Amino acid sequence: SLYEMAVEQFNRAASLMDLESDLAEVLRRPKRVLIVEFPVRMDDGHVEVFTGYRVQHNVARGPAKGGIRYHPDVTLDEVKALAFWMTWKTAVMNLPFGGGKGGVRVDPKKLSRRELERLSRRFFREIQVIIGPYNDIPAPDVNTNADVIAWYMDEYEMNVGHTVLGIVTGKPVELGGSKGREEATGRGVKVCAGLAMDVLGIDPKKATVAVQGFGNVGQFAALLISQELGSKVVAVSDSRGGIYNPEGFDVEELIRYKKEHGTVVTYPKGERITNEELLELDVDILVPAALEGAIHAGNAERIKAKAVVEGANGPTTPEADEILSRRGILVVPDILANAGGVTVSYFEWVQDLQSFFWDLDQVRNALEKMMKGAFNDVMKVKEKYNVDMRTAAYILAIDRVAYATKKR
Amino acid sequence: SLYEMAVEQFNRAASLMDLESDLAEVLRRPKRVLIVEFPVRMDDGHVEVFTGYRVQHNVARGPAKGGIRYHPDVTLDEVKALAFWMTWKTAVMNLPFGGGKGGVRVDPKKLSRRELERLSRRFFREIQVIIGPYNDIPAPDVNTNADVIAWYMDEYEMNVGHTVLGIVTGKPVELGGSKGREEATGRGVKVCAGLAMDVLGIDPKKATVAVQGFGNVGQFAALLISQELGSKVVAVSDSRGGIYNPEGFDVEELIRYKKEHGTVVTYPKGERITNEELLELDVDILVPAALEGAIHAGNAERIKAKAVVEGANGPTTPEADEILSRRGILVVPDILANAGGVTVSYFEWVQDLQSFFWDLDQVRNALEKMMKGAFNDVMKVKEKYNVDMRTAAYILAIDRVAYATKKR
Amino acid sequence: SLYEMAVEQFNRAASLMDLESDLAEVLRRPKRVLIVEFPVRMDDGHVEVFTGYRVQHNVARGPAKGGIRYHPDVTLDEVKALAFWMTWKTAVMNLPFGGGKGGVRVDPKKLSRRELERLSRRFFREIQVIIGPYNDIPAPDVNTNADVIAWYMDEYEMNVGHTVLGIVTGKPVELGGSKGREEATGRGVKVCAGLAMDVLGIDPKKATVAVQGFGNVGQFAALLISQELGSKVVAVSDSRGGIYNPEGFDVEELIRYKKEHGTVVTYPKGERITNEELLELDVDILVPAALEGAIHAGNAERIKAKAVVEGANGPTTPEADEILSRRGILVVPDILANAGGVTVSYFEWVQDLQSFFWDLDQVRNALEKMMKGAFNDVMKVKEKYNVDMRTAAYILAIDRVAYATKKR
Amino acid sequence: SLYEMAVEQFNRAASLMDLESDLAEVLRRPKRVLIVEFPVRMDDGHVEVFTGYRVQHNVARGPAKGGIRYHPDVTLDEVKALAFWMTWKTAVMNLPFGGGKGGVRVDPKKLSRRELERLSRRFFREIQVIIGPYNDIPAPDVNTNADVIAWYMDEYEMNVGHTVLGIVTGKPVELGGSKGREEATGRGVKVCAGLAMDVLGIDPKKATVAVQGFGNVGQFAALLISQELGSKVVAVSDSRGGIYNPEGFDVEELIRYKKEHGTVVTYPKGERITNEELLELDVDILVPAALEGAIHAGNAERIKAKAVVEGANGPTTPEADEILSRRGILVVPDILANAGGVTVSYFEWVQDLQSFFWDLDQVRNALEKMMKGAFNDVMKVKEKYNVDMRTAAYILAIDRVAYATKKR
Amino acid sequence: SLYEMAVEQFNRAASLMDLESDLAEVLRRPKRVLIVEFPVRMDDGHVEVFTGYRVQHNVARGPAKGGIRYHPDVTLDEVKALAFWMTWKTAVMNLPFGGGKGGVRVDPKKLSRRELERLSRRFFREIQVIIGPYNDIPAPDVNTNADVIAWYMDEYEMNVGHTVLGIVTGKPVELGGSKGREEATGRGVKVCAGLAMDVLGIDPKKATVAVQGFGNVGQFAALLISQELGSKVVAVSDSRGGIYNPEGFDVEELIRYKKEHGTVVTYPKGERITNEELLELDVDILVPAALEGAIHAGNAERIKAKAVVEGANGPTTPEADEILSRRGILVVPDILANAGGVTVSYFEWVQDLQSFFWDLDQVRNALEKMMKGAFNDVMKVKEKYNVDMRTAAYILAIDRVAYATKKR
């Protein structure tokens, strides 16, 4: 099960540290799970009942924070697991937030804008009881965005009776959102890639990078690592293929091209290569920013990268983890690496609370400052236990939640 | 599954009546399901995490109403199913209530009064979000009583900030409870036994009754059917055996004896008989007030009773239903027959809302008035569809919930 | 101290019954004591700070209930004591109420209607935090009336935001009050006088009564005992003197006369006598409805009445108590006898909650029904302990508050 | 009385300034005084009733702010007095806060961690009515700390229903507290010492300091005055004795030693001296940071210090005041000098409101900025009335509270 | 009608831009209009009923923001219109606020301070339902000030139950107000005058300015344009006349004189001139900061200024607009130019929400920063449509409100 699989990873770090048996049990089970079955009037006039979930795992360190998923395959399990991760993800970044998540079993594609807006409202009204700007602050996830998130904000105000706007994050800038939301995640990855370059003693200008995937994270990660760090993005990949060029790409251009034509492949001035080939390139840093299992048992021994900065979720598998650490390859974990979003999300909530908004430069600095921190905080725990950065991160996280849980 | 099994029974009556396809779907799924994992400090000092559930099925006709279960085998499914029934149960009785239920996976026997009181509080605080005197009014179920219910009421007031006391039912009389709570269910069964006697044209004084089981329901049903109706309880049964006496028993005495000595068996002036034998006695009315399946395929053809007033839950099985109706034997369904409890529970909530308490005679009259009603309301629907009383009851119920669901 | 003096009386009955030591301590100390110092703009333009108290003694059995005192000598102590009594007073009557009281150190006489209204509001606003229709429901006491109580009700609504009217009792009938408020107390005394007559085996028609005092309680007690019971009020008394007439007075007339001319004395057809003389008359029932200590050590042995129904507060002293019981003279205690007011006050609150008002006949029947009850409930406890009715009453009271305190 | 004694000090400055008679009366009496008697289940199982007090003196300028005291000798009086001071203390610092205080008559030493946590909760629940993040924000006092304060915060959330964390101050950093809490008070004293040096024309490097006492305040005052100011701490004292060294101590070391061994005495490289001796040393600045009355009539004439920066409460007595001012010795009053705590407490509340936390440097700067200010604001009023700094501070305070009281 | 006249101006810009027909309709009508008739006890003792209005036009972008008017001629119409403007005014400044306004039909002059305070409270209580720190934040307008505004704040807290202070703006600094309130508007005008000097390519030191009017705005506009910008205020005007002096005035002195003697006229060292004459002076920038219609059809062709910065409301008429733009004379619109007030008001509310107050320099910088912004944002839209700045401003405003309205 998706959940049990997560609890396992937790249990591991739970041992490396002397964590009270019973205390670990409360950190394991989630505080609240709300499942709702609500009707929605479809455009054609017939009513359709939908299943929705909102899970508040842990709240010891603050109000639950986590996105909402619109997928036809979403399951209580999946949600629980994702909520579970949020708890630690936020903890490692050191944010006054807890961990939660939610979703509705629905395929947005077969629903009209009117129907979506409708479902989006009924949902938020159905789970209102459990949420609030000081209890649970939803956010966009798969198949949801600033548009859906704005309907949420609205529906809430209409019920609550006054402007809240701190009830959800990821809202359009003109409606209480924050600047730097888009580049968030990428900038985070960049900050990490640099820091790793440091621990590895590599020179950002002389370094070469390979980014797997070219979505939001991929693009910005490549863009900023290239511009601000000065490294050479020698290869990027699409959902189709990849392109090489030891001379270095011009991410700027590559982006436009990726926009114009469905993919980065076909792009001239680039030696076509496969995705699995990219993962094995001879580069300093490899940023897996696409699908899971990218780095697995099969290629674990082939990776020549000195550092693997996880831009996506679960890019590398447990087995690959072991192999990679054995070979002494630094692997900056996702909970830390691609937490740049959750971080800028905290800023949005903050900016909202005081109805005063910071400009880009600030959001940037703040983001980089906390990334650098988290990185180091994890680093220390790493040496203190001689474990891999991923485990170190879970320990640090499990630590903070426990202490808070204890002090209360 | 326990739930699916109930949905089936519903689907049946759902067909006999022209019920909008999509409307039925909403009546099928439950509105809210809340699952909580809360810690509790055990006497010895260690913390133990427990699982609790509160389910609000339908609320169209009023706030959810249903007890709380303390059992180590309780499961989401079981709760959902039980909640589901409450929806129709209250509906057939015509009470301004919805349907809900809840429970905690715990064995009260291995917990100290201090620990119980503790767990009971933490629970009620954990599900507070979903309940209220106008949202969900819990009540005692298996392994919970006026004592547990009073800790509930207290804990609530301490949080809410003022005396509520309508937050839960089944409280001690001296703390906002209602009179006639004990004899409630039994009196209900009595009222039905009598009414079944009328439509059948039998004379209450000349009639003879056989009550299977001798718990709360059995005793009072036997007691009141004997005293107020004037019928002759010719046989009653224990969890061990049964006793016959065509002359007629003195329920009054039989009760004391049942108290003094663990059972009714051994009781002098009574021809010992088996439980399965009792079911086949030659009496006018047979009140199965014990275990389920009592009347099944095997004995279905043997029952000589003209009327079977179900004092327990599911005494007679589906197959037996068919056979019994085929043979033309009136079978007053449980949802109606043993709903005298839920009914007196409604009055308690009422009395509480206005902090004014009625005396016995009132509670009685009110109870009897509504039973008589429901009975007839069901009777009508029966002729209107030429179905058996049980089905008639589910139709009447499914009808009321739909209308309300429609009007809203 | 006034308070300690009360605690003593309590401690006595607390012993006669096996009451857990620590449980008795909580029943001793009061839950809440709020003291406020608020300014008030006087007519002439200068501000004057006033001291006000609101004390919620016990609340186990319901929301605190008790009047507000406007006196220049009121002290925290006095209030505490009075609140303390309310707790038991309501408990013996069996009302879903707790015990509270309050007051403001001010002499209404030196204040203009405008200033009073002002002070009355500022006060109620200052103690709002502690009160509510379900927390603490003030009422009129010394130097406060339906007028002051109405300003209270208003000020509350203006703050709360909606019509409450269950926030205080003793309001004008046209503004949420109840009928039968005036005759309340007296009717109570009447009911008791009659009941005392029963246990004593005396005939209501043949009986003779002597009422000491002629205020609200005195008049109505005399009026109703005469009209409804048929007894012969042979003597009544003023703050000046008294009048005898073994033939029997016409309370109806006596009332008018008492209105026209400052006193009952001077009234023709009446043999003038002193107050202390009245107490010793040779009558069946003596209703001390005036000042305290009326029946003390000095005259204790002189009283020839078979029953003393306390219409006032503390008419007879402790020593007199002993002597009287020794001599076998039934003494219906005040907490029970003159509780007819608090009782009709409960009804007012009830009628308010459901915004539906009962007519006189109902209020009467309800009042008498509960009086009869309380009387008997006390009677039983009396035999169970072979103590005097006053003690029996405190036990019954202390019992109910303990049980509730325990169940919670 | 402790209270009347404070009112006297107030009355003095009340005269020096033309303060409306009646307006002064409202500033004299406290707005709210809540006294609670609550039970607590002791480990052994028996219940023990405790007495707690919460007093909101004045609120005109903001919500009441003040710590909670756990002592067996605490009395309503003591609390009132302390609350009274908070009102002016915050006023002189110019903080949007009012004045309040509270305490429970209990000896924490005879209670188990479990019992304490229990009592700590029950208390906070009992005084919830009167407090809130915008009404009254408690804080730690004598015998209470971040641990007790965190149980408070928790208990509140559980009742309120959502994360507050601005309900109390002095919480652990990881649970909503603020950085710089420890060094707070000391840094304040430091800032003053410097400002006085300024006014006295002394050079921070050439100056010599003597700190009486070595608790939190003493240590940090000594540490920072030494490191940041560059002065020479020539003597510090314990609850036992003191140590001299005109060469200058190494507070850094002295602290460790004070930790290792119960006292600073015994510490080598230090000429042992008595406490009363320290007070008379020939130094520029003397920081009485220990017990009250330290500087009294007896030694008043002996002090050779040019400036006395009160780090504790009431170190110097009224008589000593007169003498000291007569001799022309600058005496920075406590309300101003040791208010660095209340100040950092305001920041904690601020950081909480916007759920964004500042880092040390900020908390420091903010603290110093306001201290510098308050100092000067007081300085001005001093010249405008040619009174001593203590009186100047009370005037400035009484002024601000009056203006606000007036504008409203 | 005042309202319809405003709707027209809107409709104009509404066309220049492709704005959905129906969307424009919602932007046209105001969301809420509350009219109240409340009594007030007059000093002499008689009650007088008053009429009050509070109008929430649009709220899409935030809570309604707008002052309160005390005038005997105020009408629903006038308010609606004024509210309507606030909506766009805040929108162009880009403040998280909506649009609202209110007023009471009363002449303050005939009311005593006591009566005013009274009325001020009753009013605020009557419109409480519609306002809040997150719904509608009143502010001072004609005939209301920090004093009235403080009675508002108080009355609210007394009802709400806790300190708010974000409920209204324009409060006294010592009571939650902000610094820089007075110079606000003027500074804004200054910022604009400079920016215009820029687009026109004029040198701030060489430029000459003529300010019509000498109230708050006029004086400060003149003061700051002179001191900070270095331009030469060659003429200012009173409600009587004006004074010329090509050498340049000393606004500093001119202010004192205007204070001492009722007007600027009579002031030596100044060539007296008429108001209509001033408007035609040969200066670079003309700041109409007095009455409306100042620049109309009649003088439209006479104005020699290269830039007209509207310090007042509607100084120039529609016809004059056309003529002025035709002649190519830059006209910085009022909604932008004299919005410096609303802007600093936003800051006050912000500072209040986090109970942390900024110092002058901050308030200034923030103000100038946003003014510069709005100016440019408007400038862009101006070129994108080749319309006059006033229209550009309305488009920019109508745009932002629509987008928000759409996203929701």
Short mmCIF file of N, CA and C in Angstrom, two decimals, chain A residues 209-214 232-251 253-255 257-258 263-279 281 283:
data_model
loop_
_atom_site.label_atom_id
_atom_site.label_comp_id
_atom_site.label_asym_id
_atom_site.label_seq_id
_atom_site.Cartn_x
_atom_site.Cartn_y
_atom_site.Cartn_z
N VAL A 209 25.54 20.26 -16.08
CA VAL A 209 24.29 19.70 -15.55
C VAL A 209 23.41 19.04 -16.59
N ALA A 210 22.68 18.01 -16.16
CA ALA A 210 21.76 17.29 -17.02
C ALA A 210 20.42 17.25 -16.31
N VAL A 211 19.41 17.86 -16.92
CA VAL A 211 18.08 17.90 -16.32
C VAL A 211 17.10 16.97 -17.04
N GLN A 212 16.55 15.99 -16.32
CA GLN A 212 15.61 15.06 -16.93
C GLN A 212 14.19 15.55 -16.75
N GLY A 213 13.57 15.93 -17.87
CA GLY A 213 12.22 16.44 -17.82
C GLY A 213 12.26 17.91 -18.17
N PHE A 214 11.17 18.44 -18.70
CA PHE A 214 11.14 19.85 -19.06
C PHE A 214 9.81 20.53 -18.80
N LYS A 232 26.77 24.60 -16.97
CA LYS A 232 26.39 24.32 -18.34
C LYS A 232 25.38 23.20 -18.46
N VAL A 233 24.14 23.56 -18.78
CA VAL A 233 23.10 22.56 -18.96
C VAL A 233 23.44 21.88 -20.28
N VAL A 234 24.09 20.72 -20.21
CA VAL A 234 24.49 20.00 -21.42
C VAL A 234 23.39 19.10 -21.99
N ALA A 235 22.30 18.92 -21.24
CA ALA A 235 21.24 18.05 -21.73
C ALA A 235 19.95 18.20 -20.96
N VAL A 236 18.84 18.22 -21.70
CA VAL A 236 17.52 18.33 -21.11
C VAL A 236 16.68 17.28 -21.82
N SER A 237 15.57 16.88 -21.21
CA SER A 237 14.75 15.86 -21.83
C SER A 237 13.25 16.15 -21.77
N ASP A 238 12.55 15.61 -22.76
CA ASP A 238 11.11 15.75 -22.90
C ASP A 238 10.45 14.44 -22.51
N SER A 239 9.14 14.34 -22.71
CA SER A 239 8.41 13.13 -22.40
C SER A 239 8.63 12.21 -23.59
N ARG A 240 9.31 12.74 -24.60
CA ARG A 240 9.61 11.99 -25.82
C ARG A 240 11.06 11.56 -25.83
N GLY A 241 11.97 12.52 -25.91
CA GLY A 241 13.38 12.17 -25.92
C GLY A 241 14.24 13.22 -25.24
N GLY A 242 15.52 13.24 -25.59
CA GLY A 242 16.43 14.22 -25.01
C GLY A 242 17.44 14.75 -26.02
N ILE A 243 18.11 15.84 -25.69
CA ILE A 243 19.08 16.43 -26.59
C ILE A 243 20.38 16.71 -25.85
N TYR A 244 21.50 16.37 -26.47
CA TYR A 244 22.81 16.58 -25.87
C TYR A 244 23.56 17.73 -26.55
N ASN A 245 24.58 18.24 -25.87
CA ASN A 245 25.39 19.34 -26.38
C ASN A 245 26.38 19.76 -25.30
N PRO A 246 27.59 19.19 -25.33
CA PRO A 246 28.58 19.40 -24.26
C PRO A 246 28.98 20.87 -24.22
N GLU A 247 28.73 21.57 -25.32
CA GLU A 247 29.06 22.99 -25.39
C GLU A 247 28.16 23.76 -24.44
N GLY A 248 26.94 23.26 -24.28
CA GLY A 248 25.99 23.90 -23.41
C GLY A 248 24.83 24.48 -24.19
N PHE A 249 23.63 24.32 -23.65
CA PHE A 249 22.41 24.82 -24.28
C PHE A 249 22.09 26.24 -23.81
N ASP A 250 21.15 26.87 -24.51
CA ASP A 250 20.70 28.20 -24.16
C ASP A 250 19.27 27.98 -23.68
N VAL A 251 19.14 27.59 -22.42
CA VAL A 251 17.84 27.31 -21.83
C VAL A 251 16.79 28.33 -22.27
N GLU A 253 16.34 29.97 -25.07
CA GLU A 253 15.85 29.56 -26.38
C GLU A 253 15.08 28.25 -26.26
N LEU A 254 15.74 27.26 -25.68
CA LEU A 254 15.16 25.95 -25.49
C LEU A 254 13.74 26.03 -24.96
N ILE A 255 13.48 26.99 -24.08
CA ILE A 255 12.15 27.15 -23.50
C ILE A 255 11.14 27.58 -24.56
N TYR A 257 11.28 27.29 -27.75
CA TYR A 257 11.13 26.18 -28.68
C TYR A 257 10.20 25.13 -28.10
N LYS A 258 10.36 24.85 -26.82
CA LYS A 258 9.54 23.86 -26.16
C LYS A 258 8.09 24.34 -26.14
N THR A 263 7.78 19.68 -28.15
CA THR A 263 8.94 19.16 -27.41
C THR A 263 10.28 19.82 -27.69
N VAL A 264 11.27 19.43 -26.88
CA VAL A 264 12.64 19.93 -27.00
C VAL A 264 13.35 19.13 -28.07
N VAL A 265 12.85 17.93 -28.34
CA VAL A 265 13.44 17.10 -29.38
C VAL A 265 13.24 17.88 -30.68
N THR A 266 13.91 17.49 -31.73
CA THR A 266 13.77 18.17 -33.02
C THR A 266 14.49 19.52 -33.02
N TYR A 267 14.75 20.01 -31.83
CA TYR A 267 15.46 21.28 -31.67
C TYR A 267 16.83 21.15 -32.30
N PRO A 268 17.18 22.00 -33.27
CA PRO A 268 18.47 21.90 -33.91
C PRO A 268 19.58 22.17 -32.91
N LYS A 269 20.82 22.01 -33.34
CA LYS A 269 21.95 22.25 -32.46
C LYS A 269 21.88 21.37 -31.21
N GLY A 270 21.43 20.13 -31.40
CA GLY A 270 21.34 19.22 -30.28
C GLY A 270 21.34 17.76 -30.69
N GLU A 271 22.30 17.00 -30.17
CA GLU A 271 22.43 15.58 -30.47
C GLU A 271 21.36 14.76 -29.72
N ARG A 272 20.37 14.27 -30.46
CA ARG A 272 19.28 13.49 -29.89
C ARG A 272 19.75 12.28 -29.11
N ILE A 273 19.13 12.07 -27.95
CA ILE A 273 19.44 10.94 -27.07
C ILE A 273 18.17 10.51 -26.34
N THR A 274 18.18 9.31 -25.76
CA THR A 274 17.01 8.80 -25.05
C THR A 274 17.00 9.27 -23.62
N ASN A 275 15.87 9.11 -22.95
CA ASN A 275 15.74 9.53 -21.57
C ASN A 275 16.69 8.72 -20.68
N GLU A 276 16.61 7.39 -20.77
CA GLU A 276 17.47 6.55 -19.94
C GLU A 276 18.95 6.82 -20.23
N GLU A 277 19.24 7.35 -21.42
CA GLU A 277 20.62 7.66 -21.79
C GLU A 277 21.08 8.90 -21.04
N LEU A 278 20.19 9.88 -20.96
CA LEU A 278 20.47 11.13 -20.27
C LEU A 278 20.90 10.87 -18.84
N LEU A 279 20.14 10.04 -18.14
CA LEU A 279 20.43 9.69 -16.76
C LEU A 279 21.86 9.18 -16.55
N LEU A 281 24.54 10.21 -18.45
CA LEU A 281 25.53 11.13 -19.00
C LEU A 281 26.68 11.35 -18.02
N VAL A 283 28.10 13.94 -16.39
CA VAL A 283 27.98 15.32 -15.93
C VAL A 283 28.19 15.39 -14.42
#
